[PDB]
Amino acid sequence: ANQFNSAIGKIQDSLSSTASALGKLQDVVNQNAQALNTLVKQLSSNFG
Amino acid sequence: KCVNFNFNGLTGTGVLTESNKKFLPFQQFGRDIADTTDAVRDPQTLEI
């Protein structure tokens, strides 16, 4: 009982203190953000 | 209303809406990160 409850408390502390454990999901937002921005910025290019 | 707006710098489509944004007295046109004009100052009067 003290092993599981303290372990869940470690998950709450590791998730609150470290925000980079979810970076796997933040990469998805970054890949979409770079893709949406690149497509619209090419409209200003002269394309020859 | 959605109308064609040209003040000296561009010809495009959009809706003019008053907001609380503040621009420098020496600034005229502005754009977002997508390189599209979201604001134009009135040539004759002072408006944003």
Binding site: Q26, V40 | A34, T36
Partner: peptide, 28 residues
């Protein structure tokens, strides 16, 4: 972590998800 409306001005439409955050939590 708007950027959605900024893309919609150039003709890029962001579609809303099928499952809302409330339904996903009800799945969990």
């Amino acid at each position: 972590t708007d950027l959605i409306c900024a893309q919609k001005f150039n003709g890029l439409t962001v579609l809303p998800p099928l499952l809302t955050d409330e339904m996903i939590a009800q799945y969990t």
